[PDB]
């Protein structure tokens, strides 16, 4: 049993996770740039990266006929960034990078399909309404 996650979530936290996407973006890029050039800034980069991993994990895991494909999406995300953690063990940074870059056209998608659903809901609140008006015409 857990309710706060489903009570208060009814946003700003998403904005937070976006600014933090760009933050880890910038984290690894600044990392590899200083890798193109000194030593402990790199250490810092690794650290705040770990930060990013952990937080997205904790704040996306917290959620609790259509269940399976959702479950698939989520677990794909998961395994994505678990191999990302593995990659924290070179030009494989590339790999690593684009993996953050996956999140992007994962989240936007998990953002658009939202609207879709949401938008589709409004569509319902048009059809019936249309139907309703017909009833109110004949009538006469």
């Amino acid at each position: 049993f857990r309710s706060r996650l489903r009570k208060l979530f009814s946003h700003r936290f998403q904005v937070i996770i976006i600014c933090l996407v760009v933050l880890d973006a910038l984290l690894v890029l600044a990392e590899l740039l200083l890798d193109l050039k000194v030593t402990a800034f790199h250490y810092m980069s690794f650290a705040i990266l770990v930060f990013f991993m952990l937080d997205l994990g904790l704040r996306i895991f917290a959620y609790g006929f259509t269940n399976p494909w959702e479950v698939a999406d989520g677990l794909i995300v998961v395994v994505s960034f678990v191999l990302d953690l593995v990659l924290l063990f070179f030009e494989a940074l590339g790999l690593l990078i684009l993996l953050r870059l996956w999140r992007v056209a994962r989240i936007i998608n998990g953002i658009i399909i939202s609207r879709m659903k949401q938008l589709e809901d409004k569509i319902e609140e048009l059809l019936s309404k249309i139907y309703h008006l017909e009833n109110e015409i004949a009538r006469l």
Side-chain angles (χ1 to χ4, degrees), residues 26-35 38-60 62-64 66-81:
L26 66 78
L27 252 183
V28 161
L29 78 87
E31 167 155 338
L32 52 94
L33 294 186
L34 285 174
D35 271 44
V38 191
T39 304
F41 300 142
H42 178 15
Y43 193 172
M44 279 286 294
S45 300
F46 173 67
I48 317 156
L49 250 201
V50 177
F51 272 69
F52 160 60
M53 314 294 310
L54 289 184
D55 68 67
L56 92 106
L58 296 173
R59 213 46 85 181
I60 282 311
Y63 271 159
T66 192
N67 267 320
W69 59 262
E70 307 164 344
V71 179
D73 182 32
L75 69 87
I76 286 189
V77 174
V78 158
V79 314
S80 310
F81 300 78

Tab-separated table of all heavy atoms in Angstrom, residues 26-81, unseen atoms left out:
chain	number	residue	atom	x	y	z
A	26	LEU	N	25.136	17.820	-19.712
A	26	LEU	CA	26.291	18.669	-19.447
A	26	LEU	C	27.388	18.007	-18.572
A	26	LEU	O	28.578	18.294	-18.734
A	26	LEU	CB	25.864	20.090	-18.969
A	26	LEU	CG	25.149	20.484	-17.657
A	26	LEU	CD1	26.095	20.504	-16.472
A	26	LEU	CD2	24.477	21.842	-17.786
A	27	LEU	N	26.992	17.083	-17.702
A	27	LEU	CA	27.926	16.390	-16.831
A	27	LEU	C	28.867	15.511	-17.621
A	27	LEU	O	30.089	15.552	-17.452
A	27	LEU	CB	27.158	15.484	-15.892
A	27	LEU	CG	27.043	15.861	-14.421
A	27	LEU	CD1	26.296	14.762	-13.708
A	27	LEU	CD2	28.407	16.067	-13.791
A	28	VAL	N	28.296	14.682	-18.483
A	28	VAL	CA	29.145	13.771	-19.230
A	28	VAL	C	29.844	14.525	-20.329
A	28	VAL	O	31.017	14.252	-20.619
A	28	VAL	CB	28.394	12.589	-19.811
A	28	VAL	CG1	29.186	11.930	-20.934
A	28	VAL	CG2	28.147	11.597	-18.716
A	29	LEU	N	29.163	15.483	-20.945
A	29	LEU	CA	29.875	16.187	-21.987
A	29	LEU	C	31.086	16.925	-21.423
A	29	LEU	O	32.189	16.721	-21.901
A	29	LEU	CB	28.945	17.058	-22.828
A	29	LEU	CG	28.444	18.424	-22.335
A	29	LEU	CD1	29.448	19.507	-22.695
A	29	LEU	CD2	27.061	18.735	-22.943
A	30	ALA	N	30.899	17.726	-20.376
A	30	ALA	CA	32.036	18.398	-19.738
A	30	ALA	C	33.084	17.375	-19.324
A	30	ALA	O	34.295	17.624	-19.405
A	30	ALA	CB	31.595	19.206	-18.530
A	31	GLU	N	32.610	16.215	-18.892
A	31	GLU	CA	33.509	15.126	-18.603
A	31	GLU	C	34.408	14.799	-19.787
A	31	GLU	O	35.624	14.837	-19.665
A	31	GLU	CB	32.731	13.895	-18.199
A	31	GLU	CG	33.582	12.667	-18.194
A	31	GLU	CD	33.028	11.630	-17.262
A	31	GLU	OE1	32.268	12.021	-16.347
A	31	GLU	OE2	33.338	10.434	-17.447
A	32	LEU	N	33.826	14.478	-20.933
A	32	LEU	CA	34.630	14.012	-22.047
A	32	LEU	C	35.460	15.142	-22.649
A	32	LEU	O	36.534	14.904	-23.202
A	32	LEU	CB	33.753	13.347	-23.097
A	32	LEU	CG	32.586	14.238	-23.500
A	32	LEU	CD1	32.965	15.050	-24.725
A	32	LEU	CD2	31.273	13.475	-23.710
A	33	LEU	N	34.961	16.370	-22.549
A	33	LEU	CA	35.727	17.532	-22.989
A	33	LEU	C	37.000	17.678	-22.181
A	33	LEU	O	38.087	17.870	-22.730
A	33	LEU	CB	34.914	18.801	-22.822
A	33	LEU	CG	33.719	18.818	-23.751
A	33	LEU	CD1	33.048	20.161	-23.643
A	33	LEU	CD2	34.175	18.536	-25.176
A	34	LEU	N	36.871	17.598	-20.863
A	34	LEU	CA	38.060	17.623	-20.038
A	34	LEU	C	38.861	16.347	-20.268
A	34	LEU	O	40.047	16.293	-19.933
A	34	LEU	CB	37.704	17.805	-18.563
A	34	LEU	CG	37.271	19.226	-18.186
A	34	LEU	CD1	36.812	19.265	-16.741
A	34	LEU	CD2	38.389	20.234	-18.435
A	35	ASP	N	38.225	15.328	-20.846
A	35	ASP	CA	38.963	14.128	-21.219
A	35	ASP	C	39.715	14.318	-22.540
A	35	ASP	O	40.745	13.678	-22.779
A	35	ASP	CB	38.070	12.891	-21.235
A	35	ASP	CG	38.022	12.203	-19.878
A	35	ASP	OD1	37.889	12.913	-18.855
A	35	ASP	OD2	38.148	10.957	-19.823
A	36	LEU	N	39.217	15.221	-23.379
A	36	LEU	CA	39.942	15.613	-24.585
A	36	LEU	C	41.147	16.498	-24.243
A	36	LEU	O	42.072	16.629	-25.045
A	36	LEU	CB	39.015	16.330	-25.573
A	37	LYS	N	41.139	17.094	-23.052
A	37	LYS	CA	42.222	17.982	-22.625
A	37	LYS	C	43.273	17.255	-21.785
A	37	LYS	O	44.063	17.890	-21.081
A	37	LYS	CB	41.665	19.173	-21.837
A	38	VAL	N	41.137	18.734	-15.362
A	38	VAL	CA	42.204	17.789	-15.689
A	38	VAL	C	41.904	16.356	-15.208
A	38	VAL	O	41.691	15.462	-16.032
A	38	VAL	CB	43.595	18.264	-15.135
A	38	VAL	CG1	44.738	17.424	-15.710
A	38	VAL	CG2	43.821	19.736	-15.444
A	39	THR	N	41.870	16.148	-13.886
A	39	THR	CA	41.825	14.796	-13.306
A	39	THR	C	40.682	14.541	-12.306
A	39	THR	O	40.011	13.509	-12.368
A	39	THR	CB	43.160	14.443	-12.599
A	39	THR	OG1	44.262	14.582	-13.512
A	39	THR	CG2	43.121	13.017	-12.052
A	40	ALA	N	40.480	15.471	-11.374
A	40	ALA	CA	39.465	15.318	-10.326
A	40	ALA	C	38.123	15.954	-10.685
A	40	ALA	O	37.097	15.625	-10.093
A	40	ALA	CB	39.966	15.877	-9.010
A	41	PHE	N	38.136	16.886	-11.635
A	41	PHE	CA	36.890	17.430	-12.151
A	41	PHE	C	36.152	16.238	-12.719
A	41	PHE	O	34.943	16.101	-12.563
A	41	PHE	CB	37.151	18.468	-13.246
A	41	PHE	CG	37.968	19.653	-12.791
A	41	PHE	CD1	38.913	20.218	-13.634
A	41	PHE	CD2	37.787	20.206	-11.531
A	41	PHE	CE1	39.667	21.308	-13.228
A	41	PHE	CE2	38.537	21.298	-11.117
A	41	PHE	CZ	39.478	21.850	-11.964
A	42	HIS	N	36.922	15.363	-13.355
A	42	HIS	CA	36.426	14.108	-13.885
A	42	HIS	C	35.772	13.232	-12.813
A	42	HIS	O	34.660	12.702	-13.002
A	42	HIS	CB	37.572	13.351	-14.514
A	42	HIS	CG	37.173	12.025	-15.051
A	42	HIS	ND1	35.854	11.680	-15.240
A	42	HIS	CD2	37.907	10.955	-15.431
A	42	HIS	CE1	35.794	10.450	-15.722
A	42	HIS	NE2	37.025	9.988	-15.847
A	43	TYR	N	36.490	13.054	-11.710
A	43	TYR	CA	35.955	12.450	-10.497
A	43	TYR	C	34.569	13.048	-10.157
A	43	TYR	O	33.576	12.309	-10.027
A	43	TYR	CB	36.969	12.699	-9.377
A	43	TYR	CG	36.800	11.927	-8.087
A	43	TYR	CD1	37.780	11.986	-7.098
A	43	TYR	CD2	35.677	11.148	-7.849
A	43	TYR	CE1	37.641	11.291	-5.906
A	43	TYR	CE2	35.529	10.451	-6.662
A	43	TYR	CZ	36.513	10.523	-5.692
A	43	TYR	OH	36.371	9.830	-4.507
A	44	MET	N	34.501	14.377	-10.041
A	44	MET	CA	33.241	15.077	-9.750
A	44	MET	C	32.132	14.693	-10.728
A	44	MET	O	30.962	14.499	-10.348
A	44	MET	CB	33.446	16.596	-9.807
A	44	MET	CG	34.045	17.215	-8.565
A	44	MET	SD	32.863	17.287	-7.205
A	44	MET	CE	31.672	18.431	-7.867
A	45	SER	N	32.528	14.598	-11.993
A	45	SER	CA	31.619	14.294	-13.074
A	45	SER	C	30.972	12.923	-12.839
A	45	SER	O	29.739	12.796	-12.840
A	45	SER	CB	32.367	14.367	-14.404
A	45	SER	OG	32.899	15.666	-14.589
A	46	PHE	N	31.812	11.921	-12.596
A	46	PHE	CA	31.381	10.578	-12.189
A	46	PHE	C	30.406	10.589	-10.994
A	46	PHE	O	29.365	9.904	-10.999
A	46	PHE	CB	32.652	9.773	-11.869
A	46	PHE	CG	32.414	8.404	-11.271
A	46	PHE	CD1	31.824	7.384	-12.012
A	46	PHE	CD2	32.856	8.118	-9.981
A	46	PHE	CE1	31.639	6.114	-11.458
A	46	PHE	CE2	32.677	6.857	-9.423
A	46	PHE	CZ	32.068	5.854	-10.161
A	47	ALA	N	30.752	11.380	-9.979
A	47	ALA	CA	29.932	11.476	-8.776
A	47	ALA	C	28.511	11.953	-9.073
A	47	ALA	O	27.527	11.252	-8.794
A	47	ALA	CB	30.590	12.397	-7.767
A	48	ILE	N	28.413	13.152	-9.639
A	48	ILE	CA	27.112	13.761	-9.879
A	48	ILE	C	26.346	12.960	-10.926
A	48	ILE	O	25.123	12.945	-10.943
A	48	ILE	CB	27.258	15.229	-10.285
A	48	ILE	CG1	28.314	15.900	-9.404
A	48	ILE	CG2	25.931	15.952	-10.142
A	48	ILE	CD1	28.975	17.117	-10.026
A	49	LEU	N	27.072	12.280	-11.802
A	49	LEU	CA	26.432	11.270	-12.650
A	49	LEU	C	25.691	10.194	-11.819
A	49	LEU	O	24.506	9.892	-12.070
A	49	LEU	CB	27.458	10.608	-13.576
A	49	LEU	CG	27.414	10.900	-15.082
A	49	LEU	CD1	28.132	9.780	-15.875
A	49	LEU	CD2	25.982	11.147	-15.592
A	50	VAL	N	26.411	9.617	-10.847
A	50	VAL	CA	25.849	8.602	-9.947
A	50	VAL	C	24.609	9.162	-9.282
A	50	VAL	O	23.587	8.467	-9.148
A	50	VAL	CB	26.841	8.178	-8.832
A	50	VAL	CG1	26.175	7.184	-7.887
A	50	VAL	CG2	28.112	7.588	-9.432
A	51	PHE	N	24.727	10.428	-8.874
A	51	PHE	CA	23.605	11.207	-8.363
A	51	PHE	C	22.408	11.027	-9.306
A	51	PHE	O	21.368	10.467	-8.923
A	51	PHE	CB	23.979	12.697	-8.286
A	51	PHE	CG	24.643	13.120	-6.993
A	51	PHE	CD1	25.931	12.704	-6.665
A	51	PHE	CD2	23.980	13.970	-6.116
A	51	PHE	CE1	26.528	13.116	-5.470
A	51	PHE	CE2	24.569	14.383	-4.927
A	51	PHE	CZ	25.840	13.956	-4.604
A	52	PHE	N	22.585	11.482	-10.547
A	52	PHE	CA	21.546	11.406	-11.582
A	52	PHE	C	20.887	10.008	-11.700
A	52	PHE	O	19.643	9.876	-11.637
A	52	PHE	CB	22.134	11.914	-12.912
A	52	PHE	CG	21.381	11.473	-14.140
A	52	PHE	CD1	20.045	11.807	-14.323
A	52	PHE	CD2	22.029	10.742	-15.139
A	52	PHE	CE1	19.361	11.391	-15.468
A	52	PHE	CE2	21.354	10.330	-16.297
A	52	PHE	CZ	20.028	10.650	-16.459
A	53	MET	N	21.733	8.984	-11.847
A	53	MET	CA	21.296	7.588	-11.940
A	53	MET	C	20.323	7.294	-10.826
A	53	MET	O	19.135	6.988	-11.052
A	53	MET	CB	22.479	6.623	-11.771
A	53	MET	CG	23.737	6.935	-12.565
A	53	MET	SD	23.543	6.803	-14.348
A	53	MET	CE	22.785	5.177	-14.503
A	54	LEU	N	20.859	7.401	-9.616
A	54	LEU	CA	20.105	7.112	-8.411
A	54	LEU	C	18.742	7.834	-8.367
A	54	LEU	O	17.697	7.185	-8.216
A	54	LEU	CB	20.953	7.423	-7.170
A	54	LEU	CG	22.138	6.496	-6.862
A	54	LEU	CD1	22.811	6.906	-5.547
A	54	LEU	CD2	21.711	5.025	-6.815
A	55	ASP	N	18.745	9.160	-8.540
A	55	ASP	CA	17.498	9.937	-8.385
A	55	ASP	C	16.405	9.620	-9.406
A	55	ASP	O	15.229	9.505	-9.044
A	55	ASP	CB	17.742	11.455	-8.324
A	55	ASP	CG	18.242	12.036	-9.637
A	55	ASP	OD1	17.482	12.039	-10.631
A	55	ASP	OD2	19.391	12.522	-9.661
A	56	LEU	N	16.789	9.498	-10.675
A	56	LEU	CA	15.811	9.148	-11.697
A	56	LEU	C	15.235	7.785	-11.360
A	56	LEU	O	14.032	7.561	-11.504
A	56	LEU	CB	16.451	9.143	-13.092
A	56	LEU	CG	17.036	7.831	-13.636
A	56	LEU	CD1	16.137	7.249	-14.724
A	56	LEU	CD2	18.466	8.012	-14.132
A	57	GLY	N	16.102	6.888	-10.885
A	57	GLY	CA	15.674	5.555	-10.505
A	57	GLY	C	14.620	5.588	-9.416
A	57	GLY	O	13.512	5.071	-9.591
A	58	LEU	N	14.965	6.217	-8.296
A	58	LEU	CA	14.081	6.269	-7.131
A	58	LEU	C	12.755	6.982	-7.433
A	58	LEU	O	11.702	6.535	-6.999
A	58	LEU	CB	14.794	6.904	-5.916
A	58	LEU	CG	16.026	6.221	-5.275
A	58	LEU	CD1	16.676	7.090	-4.191
A	58	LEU	CD2	15.705	4.843	-4.703
A	59	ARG	N	12.815	8.063	-8.208
A	59	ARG	CA	11.643	8.898	-8.513
A	59	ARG	C	10.848	8.465	-9.763
A	59	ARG	O	9.876	9.125	-10.149
A	59	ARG	CB	12.082	10.366	-8.661
A	59	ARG	CG	11.067	11.381	-8.198
A	59	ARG	CD	10.495	10.956	-6.847
A	59	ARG	NE	11.301	11.364	-5.691
A	59	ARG	CZ	10.986	11.084	-4.425
A	59	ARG	NH1	9.888	10.380	-4.146
A	59	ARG	NH2	11.771	11.505	-3.439
A	60	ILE	N	11.269	7.383	-10.413
A	60	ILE	CA	10.470	6.809	-11.498
A	60	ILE	C	9.937	5.426	-11.106
A	60	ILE	O	8.845	5.010	-11.530
A	60	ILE	CB	11.253	6.786	-12.829
A	60	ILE	CG1	11.249	8.186	-13.427
A	60	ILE	CG2	10.620	5.853	-13.843
A	60	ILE	CD1	9.860	8.800	-13.465
A	61	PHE	N	10.704	4.728	-10.271
A	61	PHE	CA	10.243	3.475	-9.689
A	61	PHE	C	9.014	3.726	-8.812
A	61	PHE	O	8.098	2.900	-8.748
A	61	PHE	CB	11.354	2.812	-8.875
A	62	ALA	N	8.999	4.877	-8.145
A	62	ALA	CA	7.869	5.267	-7.320
A	62	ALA	C	6.689	5.606	-8.212
A	62	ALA	O	6.563	6.730	-8.696
A	62	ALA	CB	8.237	6.455	-6.450
A	63	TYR	N	5.831	4.620	-8.440
A	63	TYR	CA	4.618	4.837	-9.212
A	63	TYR	C	3.437	4.196	-8.486
A	63	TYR	O	2.410	4.849	-8.239
A	63	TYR	CB	4.774	4.296	-10.639
A	63	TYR	CG	5.349	5.299	-11.640
A	63	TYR	CD1	5.948	4.871	-12.823
A	63	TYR	CD2	5.275	6.670	-11.410
A	63	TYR	CE1	6.463	5.777	-13.744
A	63	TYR	CE2	5.791	7.582	-12.322
A	63	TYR	CZ	6.381	7.129	-13.490
A	63	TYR	OH	6.892	8.024	-14.407
A	64	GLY	N	3.594	2.923	-8.130
A	64	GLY	CA	2.638	2.264	-7.254
A	64	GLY	C	2.647	2.828	-5.837
A	64	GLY	O	3.244	3.876	-5.553
A	65	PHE	N	-6.722	-3.700	-20.032
A	65	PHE	CA	-6.085	-4.817	-20.718
A	65	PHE	C	-4.698	-4.429	-21.206
A	65	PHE	O	-4.043	-5.193	-21.915
A	65	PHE	CB	-6.947	-5.272	-21.901
A	66	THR	N	-4.247	-3.249	-20.791
A	66	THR	CA	-3.150	-2.561	-21.463
A	66	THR	C	-1.785	-2.588	-20.760
A	66	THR	O	-0.808	-2.054	-21.286
A	66	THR	CB	-3.541	-1.097	-21.736
A	66	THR	OG1	-2.595	-0.507	-22.630
A	66	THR	CG2	-3.588	-0.301	-20.433
A	67	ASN	N	-1.721	-3.208	-19.585
A	67	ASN	CA	-0.489	-3.255	-18.789
A	67	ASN	C	0.824	-3.692	-19.459
A	67	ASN	O	1.867	-3.051	-19.242
A	67	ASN	CB	-0.709	-4.083	-17.522
A	67	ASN	CG	-1.112	-3.234	-16.351
A	67	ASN	OD1	-0.583	-2.140	-16.159
A	67	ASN	ND2	-2.061	-3.724	-15.561
A	68	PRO	N	0.794	-4.791	-20.244
A	68	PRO	CA	2.067	-5.334	-20.733
A	68	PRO	C	2.995	-4.331	-21.446
A	68	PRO	O	4.153	-4.256	-21.047
A	68	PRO	CB	1.622	-6.464	-21.672
A	68	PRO	CG	0.335	-6.918	-21.095
A	68	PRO	CD	-0.337	-5.653	-20.638
A	69	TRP	N	2.513	-3.568	-22.428
A	69	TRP	CA	3.382	-2.659	-23.196
A	69	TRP	C	3.942	-1.500	-22.365
A	69	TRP	O	5.049	-1.007	-22.633
A	69	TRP	CB	2.683	-2.143	-24.466
A	69	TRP	CG	1.388	-1.391	-24.236
A	69	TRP	CD1	0.116	-1.887	-24.329
A	69	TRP	CD2	1.253	-0.006	-23.893
A	69	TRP	NE1	-0.799	-0.893	-24.058
A	69	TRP	CE2	-0.126	0.271	-23.790
A	69	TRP	CE3	2.168	1.027	-23.662
A	69	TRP	CZ2	-0.612	1.532	-23.463
A	69	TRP	CZ3	1.682	2.279	-23.338
A	69	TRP	CH2	0.302	2.521	-23.241
A	70	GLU	N	3.178	-1.069	-21.363
A	70	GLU	CA	3.670	-0.113	-20.376
A	70	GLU	C	4.860	-0.728	-19.621
A	70	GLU	O	5.984	-0.178	-19.627
A	70	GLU	CB	2.556	0.255	-19.394
A	70	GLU	CG	1.278	0.735	-20.038
A	70	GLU	CD	0.124	0.712	-19.069
A	70	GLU	OE1	0.255	0.051	-18.013
A	70	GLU	OE2	-0.908	1.355	-19.364
A	71	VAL	N	4.602	-1.877	-18.988
A	71	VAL	CA	5.645	-2.630	-18.284
A	71	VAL	C	6.911	-2.777	-19.151
A	71	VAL	O	8.042	-2.644	-18.656
A	71	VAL	CB	5.144	-4.031	-17.840
A	71	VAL	CG1	6.248	-4.804	-17.124
A	71	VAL	CG2	3.922	-3.912	-16.944
A	72	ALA	N	6.703	-3.019	-20.446
A	72	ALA	CA	7.781	-3.192	-21.407
A	72	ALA	C	8.567	-1.911	-21.541
A	72	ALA	O	9.794	-1.936	-21.478
A	72	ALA	CB	7.219	-3.595	-22.758
A	73	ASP	N	7.862	-0.798	-21.739
A	73	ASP	CA	8.513	0.506	-21.837
A	73	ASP	C	9.422	0.761	-20.630
A	73	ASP	O	10.647	0.978	-20.760
A	73	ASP	CB	7.454	1.607	-21.919
A	73	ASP	CG	8.060	2.993	-22.075
A	73	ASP	OD1	9.135	3.097	-22.706
A	73	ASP	OD2	7.463	3.974	-21.571
A	74	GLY	N	8.796	0.718	-19.456
A	74	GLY	CA	9.478	0.984	-18.205
A	74	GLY	C	10.709	0.126	-18.005
A	74	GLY	O	11.797	0.648	-17.759
A	75	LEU	N	10.550	-1.190	-18.117
A	75	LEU	CA	11.693	-2.082	-17.966
A	75	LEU	C	12.753	-1.861	-19.049
A	75	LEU	O	13.928	-2.160	-18.825
A	75	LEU	CB	11.252	-3.549	-17.926
A	75	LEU	CG	10.690	-4.182	-19.203
A	75	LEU	CD1	11.780	-4.763	-20.105
A	75	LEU	CD2	9.664	-5.252	-18.842
A	76	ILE	N	12.347	-1.370	-20.223
A	76	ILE	CA	13.343	-1.085	-21.260
A	76	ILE	C	14.216	0.073	-20.780
A	76	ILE	O	15.452	0.038	-20.916
A	76	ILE	CB	12.738	-0.680	-22.616
A	76	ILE	CG1	12.123	-1.872	-23.357
A	76	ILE	CG2	13.841	-0.052	-23.510
A	76	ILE	CD1	11.703	-1.545	-24.813
A	77	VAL	N	13.548	1.100	-20.242
A	77	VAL	CA	14.220	2.242	-19.624
A	77	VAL	C	15.224	1.766	-18.571
A	77	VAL	O	16.419	2.124	-18.589
A	77	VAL	CB	13.197	3.174	-18.932
A	77	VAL	CG1	13.919	4.276	-18.165
A	77	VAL	CG2	12.203	3.750	-19.948
A	78	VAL	N	14.702	0.963	-17.647
A	78	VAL	CA	15.482	0.400	-16.564
A	78	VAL	C	16.744	-0.209	-17.141
A	78	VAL	O	17.843	0.306	-16.882
A	78	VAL	CB	14.692	-0.659	-15.780
A	78	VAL	CG1	15.644	-1.599	-15.043
A	78	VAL	CG2	13.727	0.014	-14.800
A	79	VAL	N	16.592	-1.255	-17.962
A	79	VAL	CA	17.766	-2.002	-18.445
A	79	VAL	C	18.732	-1.115	-19.233
A	79	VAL	O	19.955	-1.325	-19.231
A	79	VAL	CB	17.367	-3.242	-19.263
A	79	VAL	CG1	16.266	-4.011	-18.534
A	79	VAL	CG2	16.909	-2.837	-20.662
A	80	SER	N	18.154	-0.105	-19.874
A	80	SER	CA	18.915	0.910	-20.558
A	80	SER	C	19.929	1.410	-19.559
A	80	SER	O	21.138	1.181	-19.711
A	80	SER	CB	17.996	2.049	-21.045
A	80	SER	OG	16.864	1.563	-21.772
A	81	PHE	N	19.435	2.022	-18.491
A	81	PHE	CA	20.349	2.724	-17.596
A	81	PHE	C	21.088	1.829	-16.593
A	81	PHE	O	22.020	2.265	-15.907
A	81	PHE	CB	19.664	3.910	-16.926
A	81	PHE	CG	19.152	4.958	-17.908
A	81	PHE	CD1	17.970	4.759	-18.634
A	81	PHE	CD2	19.854	6.141	-18.113
A	81	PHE	CE1	17.511	5.713	-19.529
A	81	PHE	CE2	19.381	7.107	-19.015
A	81	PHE	CZ	18.218	6.881	-19.715
